[PDB]
């Protein structure tokens, strides 16, 4: 908003747009799907006030950042190159990278592939899972039986786009609402991630009022982005899970040793469906400071619990600046 | 922005964004390349004050409107379907369509193919030329000599995009400035449209101050649209010239009989390079009220000469109403 | 008498056979037919005071057959008709189309009502452009079995079946859709292909129908043995493209005078009852909808005199 | 008299016109021609005691025209000829080919010498398969200008030129290669296309040649207005594939009795002098090589009686 | 190896590798899938001792022979051109061609298309069947039911490769073992050739000891070839069954008139699945000396029954020489 | 040969063949173009005798290693994953990687992307050049004017293969001979790397006797490999220079900090044409032990100077085990 400043920086893949606020060590924030730099609006002044230079990018394919045409231009190595060039373009040599949802694997792999640049890593909602042995799409395909796991539904180009483009604002509204903590029962919350043959993912989205974290003016911002960007850039992220599995094969099973932080929502499927990865943290994230679970919190962790995320981030950052268990938080 | 209202309407091709202002007969406004509904900001209050409902769309491929993946989804028949469905979605059965730059052939073919909907047509900068016998790319490739005509440069996917994406804001400012009336000499103006082999089109763009009609805040708006939309939807318009020439073959040499209006800039190549089209207006636009040439005006006619364009549109429109 | 002409068009060239003097009646044949399908109408129209011009549709006989599949989209057929009217020295015309020629004629009247000032539609009713993608509709019809229109979509698929014996395939198809040739049971299954089967596996065998002599079959088969069937089939392969191109006329009615003639034993008639029932709104200038008892698909050949009477009576009515 | 037949072949079907009784003489026309190019030979062969069968080559007239370009490779033409001999109830035949029919006949004799026991070659000499890729040779001929065979390689390119006016293009080509129609100067440039030009830009205009009446041109143009030119041109688009397929016969000679007839004013004759000079080794069973004075490319039509005499005299000689 | 000499000869399709031994009339040996010239190691000294020049090639796609990239470069006419040019490159005008497994149709069509070069033909394991009316893939797809016939499994590029590359040596050993006479019951033997959906062909391969004809050192040779060559050249042979059926249409139903010899294994599916082809030998191979069925012998006939195969070949060859 | 043992190991991209010899720390050797594991035959017993476990792989696309069909399966990240999986498959956690010619960028990038695995790196003939700003093929295209730089000549699939397949043994013989130290004058040596339009690269290869380092039996081994493998796998390496430039963008300008060693030949074009990269070593290889130039030595450094390479490698290794300038060596 105000105090925060928009920047356009050049990277090998092209233009990256970001909003930065504050002075001090660089904290690079990486949003998820289908989101925006604007998802960090609550973190930007808190990190700035706490003595940090926070920079929230638009991920490749999103908002005002470059959106290359080729699908493989959204492979993990491209996002990691995007982050590296942003740190350098901001005049820094190192940074803490914090990622949410798809920004979490982007942040983890940034820390994994360039540890001399990304010297600490925060992960929200999606735990770190090392590159594994099996092809992801063959895996997403076991799931569901009958119904198609939404990640498989997302693979075919133009398919999910056609569904979403029917009414972008409505589709975002349903998705934002549906994954908010407590918006759906566990049981419908789970059925939301599967698409019956011939159906649409949004057929199981709720239609009631916007959640408390999303005003109509906030939705105008989000829908205003995707009505302009389209969804292909965002969706191409999912369309590289196989390519990423090949590219990261040199880091098969590799741990992130740098200091790390995990914050997840108790009502977040991204957290509860990958509990095994989360429980492997003593081996996969040996430098983890702590794993925090926010009770009653859904998927949009840094907007559903902005003050709690702010508190945990800056406490963790400050601990690193002045130099295990699941910790569960109430409210 | 203050008076005008944003809307999203459904069309057979997907969502169309528009900004409308005023009450009365529908005047549909269609921007060109590389612009936005925002190019009509000075016309929306003027038409509204004159008793019209002005509706400025984002053309398919631009701003908040749908941007299909397929290059041929930007063929002329898609734009015309977009315009028709916009008139119907706004609750109207007829409308006047006014188009600038590429919006001009879009308005012309809207008037040509659906004369029962678009009952009068205004064309700015780009004259009406009926569908001809020659394949458009065969001509674009002929002129310029060793240098490549910019429309020909725009044909290959990703080529013009790669150039513009180097600096979307910078490219727009140069193009906006280069085509402003008097910003370049006529010689400099003419070669701006030709690309020497290995060169970039923007290599002949001027640098320095923005033209008077475009503030830095105006550039923030335009560049903010294209930093989100990309340039492919916009460029795909050029990539259908041969497809349109095929599609429009059933209206080969056909005139537009509706009442029509033409406004062009004396220093606009889009106007002065098609003098032959203007000379055929007595036959091709037999319902023409008048052809207006604005002396000293460049390409961005409704922003470079907003008051005279406003007056010409409303007086012409009122003329139809009596 | 009747005369062959080759006229220049934007897509290349249209071959046609014209007969008579007077207001121009452009005749547009269906699938898998020929200008020759109108042979009984050309002298009748000439005797009634009209200049009848029966084209070979793009892809057929002596007309241009471009290689690209989408060169057979509806807008191409319409430019073909427009250019033919102009090449014959006329400014307006009555267009009459049968089977696939019916939507070609209907869209000619719809897009250029200043040229096509009246329209005749045979066998296939007019349905305005709707919002559902045609191939999605053709899919989930049948189940299970593949609706023949879906069968026609894949390039080379129907061609490989027909080319086994162009003449035999033509005869079976002409025979199968003749009024009274099959039970309803047989008639309905003819339009569906079981997986791995051929469409013609359900074609009847035996004697040629009454409207088709052996010499008639020689003409038809002599054409397709030279042209092949791709141009004809590419017509079906543009239903989705057409649905996109015609979106600017979504739900639009045809307002100028129109005439419909269909067969009671024509599936094209009974499967599009809704379209026929919507005529008061979709064809408000409709003169009448005639359903000919016992008539199959090949209406202007199975009921040559009745079609001639209705057409010339309708035509005479317009200019009176 | 002469009779039309449709015979079944592995590639689909060959249409042909046969006349006479006796040993089978299969006639194979060139580009852009027809079975009809042999019209003066069919009665002559019948009167001399032979059953002459003039096919439409695959891609032409009423014969099958498969979609794939490589379905016009030389082995397909040879299976077509083999299947035709068998479909006509014969076990062996004499094959006589003109222009592109010459390599088709030559390779039929080469690959199935037990079926094709004698071979006639008109206009185009026999050259055994060599090791150089043909398209590489056609490239660096001319420079600078594009040899017409290279011009024929790209799909749609020659077709777009010809389809502007199939009849006019045919007439110009037939006229240009008629004996004496052009100066050497004009004749040589006809086979090269300057960049951006059309091959027919160097075709002569004016009266039809003496061998081609207006009614003759109606037949030819009536065929290609129905078939299009892709099947015919796909023949040229297989020179490289043929060069690969025929590698098992690299440098192989044709040993059974053979006959060559060429025109002195035929470029196909003068540009392949080396092939003609190598006949003692490449065609050791050669009866004679006849070069007809003043004759252009269309040898069996420009010199109908001389070709008839040489063929029947040669044929009578073999079985004596 | 000791007596035999390695050679590289030029052919129109590129380099062909072979190992030759002996002096006299040329006997060209053609291995099958997935083998090597090395499959003829027991025949090279025997033919040489009998007065013949035996030449065992690496088929195109195998070992040290050229392996073109294009799938259709493995069509039957390429193999025949390879064989012809090999005869000519070795300084001969004629030869006897003897082929095993896929080398059998290669030898048959070599004899069919160039009878002036290949004056007698031996066929092992795979009977001669003249080119028929039915598209080969239409048949392969019909049989097996819900399970997929292995030739049909081999059609898609990379599919069979991915399975085999999991463990080239292991796959070969299983296939070599599975088709050895008596290694499997006839029921197990038959389903080895069908792949249930989602399964791998090698899922039905036996494990355990190598067959008697193949030492570990022999497997090192075979696996060492395929670890370098890959399997695509070998599999591309199957990927041309429909192309060959088109290419060979000019020899539809044609018989091979040369003197011919057939040797097959009683427990070899390649032999027993084509009994109909064997029953037509009086018409299709009218120059057949005799059809030999080796009881208890499996697929790898010249290695499973080397002495009897050696005797049959040389006595047949000597029979031609008088 | 003997003492050395062949192994086949499984990697994410498939099978890697290698020959290993010795006991002690792992020294992974990576050959160049168009070579083989067999190029290290002289290093295998010397490293084994000096207390090291030397493992010479066949690079992806070569000899008995896997040769995937897709061209991009030869991107740098695949070679680096190949090396990582080989270290793990041999029961080790770290290794010294030593690469020659194309194995040198493979070894450097292995050390750059997985420094926790590859803890020291040796580079022969080809210096380390960080990922740069310009697209490689646009660069290879400036070169020559008229004549086509062989790297550009190598891009079109099937093009160089057709040339080489005309006579694989002859082509290797000419290339091996042509780049041997002192085999050609500087001037012809340079013209060898350019192809006039319509010509063949081998048209400028010498035809005399094999160089001293290559016996007829050695050439039988090399030609015996490529007559079986074909050249596409080897050439696809060159066909990924652009893809590599994208993939390594996250390491733009990045240095290798681990201990490094460079050995190059004085008569090696690979050394003299990239002198600028070699002279940037204080910044790009801050951990360089030394840069060694072997006088009179050509391209095939570890075969043209086997004892000198052995001596420099083991002295360097031993220095690391017990814990700037161009150094030029004579003979
Ligand atoms: C874990 As998600 C909602 O970005 O697919
Ligand atoms: C007609 As224009 C100069 O806007 O491309
Ligand atoms: C009703 As129909 C003969 O056009 O498929
Ligand atoms: C010599 As010709 C008519 O076949 O190009
Ligand atoms: C004929 As076979 C079993 O070797 O594919
Ligand atoms: C440096 As090199 C001979 O592998 O291209
Ligand atoms: Cl995109
Ligand atoms: Cl810090
Ligand atoms: Cl787009
Ligand atoms: Cl920028
Ligand atoms: Cl066609
Ligand atoms: Cl065709
Ligand atoms: Cl291969
Ligand atoms: Cl393995
Ligand atoms: Cl490969
Ligand atoms: Cl060490």
Numbering used by the authors:
A (entry chain A), F (entry chain A): 14 to 336, 346 to 353
B (entry chain B), E (entry chain B): 14 to 335
C (entry chain C), D (entry chain C): 16 to 335
Manuscript text:
Soluble epoxide hydrolases (EHs) are a class of enzymes that can promote the asymmetric hydrolysis of epoxides to their respective 1,2-diols and have emerged as versatile biocatalysts for the production of chiral intermediates. The whole-genome sequence of Streptomyces sp. CBMAI 2042, an endophytic actinobacterium isolated from Citrus sinensis branches, was explored by genome mining, and a putative α/β-epoxide hydrolase named B1EPH2 and encoded by 344 amino acids was selected for functional and structural studies. Each protomer of B1EPH2 adopts a classical α/β-hydrolase fold, which consists of a cap domain, which is the more flexible and less conserved region, constituted of six α-helices, and a catalytic domain. A group of 12 aromatic and aliphatic racemic epoxides were assayed to determine the activity of B1EPH2; remarkably, this enzyme was able to hydrolyse all the epoxides to the respective 1,2-diols, indicating a wide-range substrate scope acceptance.
The B1EPH2 crystals belong to space group P4122 and diffract to a maximum resolution of 2.2 Å. The structure of B1EPH2 was solved by molecular replacement using the structure of the soluble epoxide hydrolase B from M. tuberculosis, which shares an identity of about 49%. The r.m.s.d. for superposition of the three different protomers in the asymmetric unit is about 0.3 Å, indicating that they are very similar and there are no large conformation changes between them. This is, at least to our knowledge, the first description of a hexameric soluble epoxide hydrolase, in contrast to several dimeric soluble EHs and a monomeric soluble EH characterized by our research group. The hexamer is stabilized predominantly by hydrophobic inter­actions, with similar interaction surfaces of 724 and 708 Å2 between protomers A and B and protomers B and C, respectively, and with a further nine and 14 ionic interactions observed between protomers A and B and protomers B and C, respectively. Similarly to other soluble EHs, the active site of B1EPH2 is located in a large groove of about 35 Å between the cap and hydrolase domains, and residues from both domains participate in catalysis. The conserved catalytic triad is placed in the hydrolase domain and is constituted by Asp114, His312 and Asp281. There is, however, electron density in the active site of B1EPH2 which has been modeled as cacodylate. The cacodylate makes interactions with key residues of the active site, including Asp114 from the catalytic domain and Tyr116 and Tyr251 from the cap domain. In contrast, similar to that of human hEPH, the B1EPH2 active site has a volume of approximately 630 Å3 according to the POCASA webserver.
